[PDB]
Ligand binder design. Structure first.
Ligand SMILES: Nc1nc2c(ncn2[C@@H]2O[C@H](COP(=O)(O)OP(=O)(O)OP(=O)(O)O)[C@@H](O)[C@H]2O)c(=O)[nH]1
Ligand SMILES: Nc1nc2c(ncn2[C@@H]2O[C@H](COP(=O)(O)OP(=O)(O)OP(=O)(O)O)[C@@H](O)[C@H]2O)c(=O)[nH]1
Ligand SMILES: O=P([O-])(O)O
Ligand SMILES: [Mg+2]
Length: 1095
DNA sequence: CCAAAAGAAGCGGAGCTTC
């Protein structure tokens, strides 16, 4: 414990006494931090970090000598050095702003004088920065080591923070704003996704600062200072960045949107550097100069990422030995630049790739206001992905003369749901544009003869990339489909690419050529296929054609099939057997493939099946209201409007309804994962309205080209044959929009009744300003809910089976109840420690608990079994970081603003998170982990969760391994895993100790609505133990089913495309049997095994 | 549904209050 002497030697002039018991001003920086046993930062001990690092960055030799290494990144050249010189000068400006801000803070309200007289301003939420000041005559000034080091972190953050931010979707923006997801204005998600919230900006900034400070937290110090001082610094640096215009602050007024929303929300956007700014080619020189082990860097050649010890954002969950092996294997993979695609991207140029793959140049007078904002979002994502690719290409290009021989490695970590996520936002795994330029897939193929197996593999790669559904047809039929396409519609695009692969040039009309040839086949991988096929055509040696073109072994309706296999817990039914075959589990058909299944046996997949069931359920709803003309008319109107704008809905001339797989895909999936119907309804309406806003632009684009054209032949000309036919379409639209906004269905005692809203749509349409408002969106949603979504939900249950629904409900309940108790106990143990600290004279309110105190509390919850263990994976469903534990500001800036709430790592309610956690985890997550670690694991692949990109040389073996990995994951029992955790929970829980809040929440999950009223502790305890029994019985069933199935002859082709199914070689032959016969025999084996447990 | 949370600011020195 010589840590007091150590840190005082480094900072002896900081104000106050490094004794928490001392009576005057106490220094909480020295009380909170210690020197690390091994150096973490090269700026520790430096009198002037900004001067030292600026000299370090002034030349290659100085950089190498400062980093104590023989050779620096070759990207650090003359042009990049000059840019860092200017950036170091800017750091001096930031530091100068910070010093002036401190001076003003000390002068305002005589704070400096009071602090000098003994007022403990260094313990205030806005004064924790006084812990790193030094006395300077009659005033105070920053410690220069600490100030300048924080500024260096500020500069690194400024350069790379945007590229490390998370992606905000509709759910995120809803959580941030307090506006219900379904009523979110258009472009609001775009506004919020492009910016950072305060917590988002400050916490990432604070993380950097503390990292560069290079010290270690004292476990016995209050989090109010260990987390508070760097956050205080981060907040002042953000404020300085706003003054300097490096960051823009936008306070978004929610009452402009929703008048009863009082929230005003800060949004921080970093000012973008030029795409051609040399600093982009090497944006981490500071990071790599300051830190002994840099986080932010690219991994070239034999420089490989280390293996993460803990789950992403779950410090309490250690990656298992099997997970770590998976991570090592994926980080070992070498990725390479495919030069022809980069050259193609470069030659088209940013502007043309925007025109082709985004929305091109937008003129804000032929575009609907709402549609214009969606198109701005489409352009942004493509643009950022392009710039990020070429920044990476600049760095790669410096490493060698031939860029295609520089190996690239990527860091991965295991997420909470057991997925191996590639770190970063613009890597091969996450960005489609990058995925076609940087690849691990490689093959040398003999394409000199089109009857080769090599040429067939090549064809499969091409067909899949061009939107041919390769898993639905045999290789032979596939081959003819591709040939027709290549020799037909794609031919003029192919001729252009031939010419590009000869001269390096593209014609002025390149975008038109590609757009016309590809149609709705257009994608980045489609461009890769045209590039690769044209390369083969001009290839000197077709006998040894080298290509990164891949085939994706892709999961067929993966999550739902996984759920059906992993969590169905009773006897076998013939419907289950038929429905699971749609996902590639074949019983009694040796060597059967998904290609064969879809072409000869059953052309309907699981989502098509559920759509078929929706059609049946819709008829049944129609018949219950046959005499009710207003009701029949509402239904007709909802269907009409959907038909008018959505591709997956069709109505024939005599009113025959046709539905495609695509409308059931997401609803089915997210229903299993616990979504409500309202959320599904809102999403279907969003897709309708987006199409309407898009059509409004098509109208303006018609009125400009032709002023004397009718609104009927402006909105429905491309959709209808004649003008009268376009007039009947327009009449339908106005009829539908009026009735669907003015009238809503309401469920009154199990009956549907129509009610007037009093807020129906009327008035002349102005295509530019046209917006379907919140009250009118609500009405469309309620119509969608009762007339489409509810029937879809009935259809969904029929398809996946009631037994699975029952299993997922029990899983949800157990995990929610357990999470409620963990949350509440933690909060109580925290409240009990704070009442104890209230007696401590050294302790002040605002100081929280120490890390050791929080670790003690977290470890005291272990007998409630917060972790689910599978033997190869660990899940912690309750785990979160939230502001509700400390319920207090952590730090503010020196203007009393940027008040960051204190966030704590603690358990919180799961809600429905247990279902997707366990299904994704033990489904696709376990499959991929197995695939990474299994005997003869496929090499040189890219894994994207439920599909794996494979080099053309290894498509057969890798697919068969992938299907084997699927079978392996189907030997799991997530309910058993949940049961084992919940059973331990149940012997240690004391429901009496819980708060009325916690008790109420458990009541909702464990009890029927008519029993939450007067529920005793003993009532909800008996109800909780009944769920334990239910879990036990389900887990037993799943266990038997899996054993029974292993004895039968099985062909597995869930990871489809190639036609390489895994054979389990089960010795009981169920060939030449109907599903009814198979179910009867499996059930005989079930009972046989069930009677074995009896004895 | 899930894969990461997330109002601002005056006055005063925490936490209530107004927008
Ligand atoms: N919780 C959640 N999971 C999703 C969602 N979308 C996709 N997933 C998961 O990712 C899996 C694979 O996604 P996809 O390949 O796009 O869809 P799929 O279910 O395999 O269906 P197809 O490939 O079209 O046959 C799904 O089965 C889900 O488990 C979603 O919106 N919510
Ligand atoms: N849990 C979860 N997984 C998702 C969700 N959406 C997509 N995924 C998974 O992530 C993968 C993304 O791979 P991409 O090839 O980039 O496809 P995408 O990002 O979904 O874009 P699309 O081509 O429209 O499917 C999908 O195949 C799914 O496996 C989601 O909402 N929740
Ligand atoms: O094009 P698919 O059949 O691999 O999805
Ligand atoms: Mg899939």
């Amino acid at each position: 414990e010589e840590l007091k002497e150590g840190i005082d030697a480094v900072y002896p002039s900081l104000v106050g006494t490094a004794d928490s018991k001392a009576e005057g001003i106490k220094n909480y920086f020295k009380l909170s931090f210690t020197l690390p046993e091994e150096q973490k930062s090269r700026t520790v001990g430096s009198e002037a970090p900004l001067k030292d690092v600026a000299q370090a960055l002034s030349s290659r030799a100085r950089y190498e000598l400062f980093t104590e290494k023989e050779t620096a990144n070759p990207a650090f050249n003359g042009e990049v050095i000059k840019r860092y010189k200017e950036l170091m000068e800017h750091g001096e400006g930031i530091a100068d702003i910070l010093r002036s801000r401190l001076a003003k803070f000390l002068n305002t309200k005589d704070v400096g004088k009071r602090f000098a007289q003994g007022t403990e301003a260094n313990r205030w939420v806005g004064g924790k920065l006084l812990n790193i000041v030094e006395q300077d005559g009659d005033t105070f000034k920053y410690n220069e080591q600490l100030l300048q080091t924080a500024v260096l972190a500020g500069l690194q953050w400024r350069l790379t923070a945007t590229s490390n931010t998370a992606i905000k979707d509709a759910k995120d923006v809803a959580a941030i704003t307090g506006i219900d997801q379904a009523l979110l204005p258009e472009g609001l998600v775009e506004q919020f996704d492009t910016g950072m919230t305060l917590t988002e900006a400050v916490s990432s900034l604070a993380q950097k600062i503390e990292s560069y400070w290079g010290l270690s937290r004292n476990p016995n110090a209050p989090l109010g200072y260990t987390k508070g001082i760097p956050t205080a610094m981060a907040a002042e640096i953000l404020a300085a960045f706003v003054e300097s215009t490096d960051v823009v602050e936008n306070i978004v007024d929610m009452s402009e949107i929703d008048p009863d929303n009082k929230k005003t929300i800060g949004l921080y956007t970093i000012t973008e550097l030029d795409s051609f700014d040399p600093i982009n080619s090497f944006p981490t020189a500071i990071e790599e100069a300051v830190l002994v082990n840099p986080t932010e860097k690219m991994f070239f050649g034999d420089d490989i990422p280390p293996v993460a010890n803990t789950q992403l954002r779950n410090p309490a969950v250690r990656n298992t030995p099997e997970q770590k092996a998976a991570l090592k294997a994926e980080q070992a993979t070498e990725f390479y630049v495919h030069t022809p695609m980069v050259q193609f991207y470069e030659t088209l140029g940013k502007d043309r790739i925007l025109e082709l793959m985004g929305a091109g140049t937008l003129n804000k007078e032929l575009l609907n206001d709402n549609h214009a904002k969606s198109l701005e979002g489409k352009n942004r994502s493509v643009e950022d992905s392009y710039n990020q690719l070429f920044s990476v290409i600049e760095q790669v290009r410096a490493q060698s003369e031939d860029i295609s021989t520089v190996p690239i490695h990527y860091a991965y970590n295991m997420t909470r749901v057991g997925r191996m996520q590639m770190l970063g936002k613009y890597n091969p795994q996450s960005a489609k544009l990058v995925r076609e330029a940087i690849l691990p897939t490689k093959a040398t193929l003999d394409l000199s003869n089109q009857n080769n197996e090599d040429f067939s593999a090549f064809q499969l790669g091409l067909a899949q990339a061009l939107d041919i559904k390769v898993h639905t047809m045999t290789r032979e039929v596939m081959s003819d489909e591709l040939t027709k396409l290549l020799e037909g519609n794609l031919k003029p695009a192919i001729d252009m690419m031939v010419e590009f692969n000869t001269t390096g040039s593209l014609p002025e009309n390149a975008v038109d050529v590609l757009n016309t040839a590809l149609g709705d086949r257009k994608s980045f991988v489609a461009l890769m296929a045209l590039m690769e096929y044209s390369r083969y055509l001009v290839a000197e040696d077709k006998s040894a054609f080298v290509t990164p073109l891949y085939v994706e072994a892709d999961g067929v309706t993966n999550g739902p099939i996984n759920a059906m296999m992993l969590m169905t817990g009773g006897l076998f039914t013939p419907d289950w057997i038929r429905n699971i075959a749609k996902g590639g589990l074949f019983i009694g058909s040796p060597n059967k493939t998904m290609n064969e299944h879809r072409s000869t046996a059953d052309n309907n997949d699981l989502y098509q099946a559920s759509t078929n069931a929706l059609m049946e359920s819709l008829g049944k709803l129609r018949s219950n209201y046959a005499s009710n003309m207003p009701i029949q008319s509402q239904i007709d109107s909802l269907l009409s409007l959907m038909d008018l704008f959505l591709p997956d809905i069709n109505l024939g001339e005599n009113g025959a309804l046709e539905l495609k797989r695509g409308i059931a895909k997401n609803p089915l999936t997210i229903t299993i994962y616990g979504s409500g119907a309202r959320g599904i309804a809102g999403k279907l309406v969003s897709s309708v309205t987006d199409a309407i806003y898009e059509r409004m632009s098509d109208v303006l684009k018609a009125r400009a080209k032709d002023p004397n054209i009718s609104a009927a032949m402006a909105m429905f000309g491309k959709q209808a044959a004649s003008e009268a036919h376009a007039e009947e379409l327009l009449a339908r639209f106005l009829k539908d929009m009026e009735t669907l906004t003015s009238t809503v269905p309401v469920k009154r005692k199990g009956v549907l009744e129509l009610q007037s809203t009093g807020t129906g749509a009327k008035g002349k349409i102005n295509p530019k300003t046209y917006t379907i408002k919140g009250e009118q969106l609500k009405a469309l949603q309620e119509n969608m809910l009762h007339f489409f979504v509810e029937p879809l939900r009935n259809g969904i249950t029929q398809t996946v089976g009631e037994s699975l629904v029952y299993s997922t409900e029990q899983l949800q309940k157990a995990t929610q109840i357990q999470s409620v108790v963990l949350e509440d106990m933690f909060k109580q143990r925290v409240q009990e420690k704070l009442a104890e600290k209230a007696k401590d004279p050294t302790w002040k309110k605002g100081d929280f608990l120490t890390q050791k105190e929080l670790n003690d509390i977290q470890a005291s919850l272990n007998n409630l079994a917060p972790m689910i263990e599978t033997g190869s994976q660990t899940f912690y469903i309750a785990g979160s970081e939230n502001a509700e534990v400390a319920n207090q500001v952590l730090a503010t800036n020196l203007d009393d603003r940027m008040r960051v709430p204190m966030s704590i790592y603690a358990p919180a309610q799961a809600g429905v998170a247990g279902i997707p956690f366990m299904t994704i985890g033990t489904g696709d997550g376990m499959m991929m982990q197995t695939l990474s670690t299994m005997k003869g694991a496929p090499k040189n692949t890219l894994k994207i969760f439920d599909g794996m990109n494979i080099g053309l040389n290894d498509i057969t073996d890798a697919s068969r391994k992938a299907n084997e990995a699927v079978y392996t994951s189907w030997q799991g029992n997530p309910i058993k895993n949940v049961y084992e955790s919940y059973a331990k929970f149940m012997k240690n829980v004391d429901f009496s100790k819980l708060s009325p809040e916690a008790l109420e929440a458990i009541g909702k999950s464990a009890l029927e609505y008519d029993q939450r009223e007067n529920a005793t502790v003993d009532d909800i305890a008996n109800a909780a133990s009944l769920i334990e029994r239910n879990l036990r019985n389900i887990a037993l069933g799943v266990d038997i089913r899996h054993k029974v199935l292993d004895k039968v002859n099985l062909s597995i082709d869930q990871m489809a495309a190639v036609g390489a199914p895994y054979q389990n070689n089960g010795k009981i032959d169920l060939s030449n049997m109907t599903p009814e016969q198979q179910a009867d025999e499996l059930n005989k084996l079930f009972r046989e095994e069930l009677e074995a447990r009896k004895q």
